[PDB]
Fold this sequence. Notes:
The structure is a homodimer. The first copy, chain A, is of the alpha/beta class. Chain A contains 13 helices and ten strands. At the A-B interface, helix 5, helix 7 and helix 10 of A face strand 8, helix 5, helix 7 and helix 10 of B. One adenosine-5'-diphosphate binds next to helix 8 and helix 9 of chain B. Chain A: Its EC number is 2.7.1.1.
Amino acid sequence: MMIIVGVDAGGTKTKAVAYDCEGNFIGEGSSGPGNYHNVGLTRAIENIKEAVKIAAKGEADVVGMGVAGLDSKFDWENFTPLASLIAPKVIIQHDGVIALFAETLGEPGVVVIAGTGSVVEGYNGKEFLRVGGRGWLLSDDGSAYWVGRKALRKVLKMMDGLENKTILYNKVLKTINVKDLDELVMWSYTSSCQIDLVASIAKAVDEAANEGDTVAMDILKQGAELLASQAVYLARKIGTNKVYLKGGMFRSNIYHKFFTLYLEKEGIISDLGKRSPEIGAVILAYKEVGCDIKKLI
Amino acid sequence: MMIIVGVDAGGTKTKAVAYDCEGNFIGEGSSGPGNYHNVGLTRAIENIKEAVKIAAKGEADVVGMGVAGLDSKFDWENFTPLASLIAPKVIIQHDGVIALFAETLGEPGVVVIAGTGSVVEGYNGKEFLRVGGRGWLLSDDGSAYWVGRKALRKVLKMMDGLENKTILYNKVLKTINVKDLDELVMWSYTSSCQIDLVASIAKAVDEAANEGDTVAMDILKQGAELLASQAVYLARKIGTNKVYLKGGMFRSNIYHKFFTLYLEKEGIISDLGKRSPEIGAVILAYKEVGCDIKKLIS
Ligand SMILES: Nc1ncnc2c1ncn2[C@@H]1O[C@H](COP(=O)(O)OP(=O)(O)O)[C@@H](O)[C@H]1O
Ligand SMILES: Nc1ncnc2c1ncn2[C@@H]1O[C@H](COP(=O)(O)OP(=O)(O)O)[C@@H](O)[C@H]1O
């Protein structure tokens, strides 16, 4: 039969699931990061290949992959030529695209992915579209990173006495394990360009907001609305009144509420994601080769 | 014959001027960075000593120094022990403090220094106070870096079609030499943690605003007001009605206009520099030892 493998090549790991063309599961596999910016081009390719081989228990006939790190034509040019060696037929898209297909099952739609970074991905039946998702410095509005940065800056002002200290102050310090301005400054000397670390602070903001801290509540509001406006823009551009929401930021009740209130006022319906990215990659492959998605899901 | 040396130990270089206790100029000298975060503790101390020795043409009796990089108690603990060895009497303060004293002549006051980064320094006659000045990630509101980041973020939204492209778009792309989103992303991969580069974009923002770009004017107005609010705060805590303004950001006519407008609404008088930091370091020393500042400045 035809062995089809869906792959989610991420920043920390690569996960793959193999199915035949009749919706039957074959196996699954995992390997290191598939994002070449993190482990180099060759290592990234090898990891994707490893995951695919484990899942397929040998060679695969078709491989659909959602890859993180392809944020510029230059990335695609560097990656595509080698990724194509993985199998006789390989379909390559952004990691956000398979996350979208996991929910739309290959049909048009828009998905908001708000985790460490943020992005709004869309598909209109022919072209794939995107807004945001270009990194922590240039973009990523309302991501965990964006939230943590705002929190850090607010805490500094409290330390300066410009504003009174709120629950947020200790929550943040607890997260990065610093007890005062002196340790915070020292912390910035070696951690300022530590993306994951800054992003981890979003959890402290959520905790503070739940406990009644309006300063924390306001940060979530601003981030959520900034990202939600982008979601509305793409949804309107694609022609759908429903968007899917995915990512760690949505684990925050207050963040999710501000986000949905914004969408609702704009006439947009939303649904939290319920399928895995890799399944969306298998769907990406099914669409390309002609296997019935109905037998799969 | 007492030899007093004022030193401005910065991130790029160190400047020193020597005078006696009677206000007579003795000499001047320069050396590398005095900021130990940029060249390491030993080399920073080494450069400061070199500058001092060159200006004083030998050993100095008293050295007043304004040092960049002492932004945490840990820095002071690392720096002070060795720096104190440069001369029998050494007075050490933040680089922003000597910039202030250069203008207040050792009297209470507040100074806003807005360049690549930003900070507000003050003296109340008893101690020195500070707001901001803790780095690009945690602080530096209204600094060139702050303005540069806001500009980059606006440009991205223009490329995404979320906002109309204005003059700022082309101004930014020209400054960092990129022609589109693809190149801007590639640029981010190698420039995101390069502070100087991001801050250089503030120049493009000023250009756009002078050509009437509403988007660029808003960035300058907002950044200026965010920082100005902090200057008002310190001025009020210090108990002064005047603040001094220094730094590359004030070279922007628009930024300066909005910064001053904010201060005047609060009844605060502003004033651009007029003196150099090294002179402020000499004043700092003079106050410590008791030499008459009126003989130094007039
Ligand atoms: N309840 C919560 N409230 C706010 N932020 C949260 C919450 N849970 C997790 N996060 C944040 O979201 C991020 C996790 O994102 P996730 O989507 O799981 O992975 P990634 O985005 O790196 O692929 C972390 O940076 C974390 O701080
Ligand atoms: N007219 C101007 N408009 C906007 N920004 C300017 C202007 N002139 C200089 N700058 C910015 O200010 C900074 C120079 O600050 P400066 O105080 O001279 O040095 P530093 O702060 O590094 O010690 C640069 O980052 C530059 O982009």
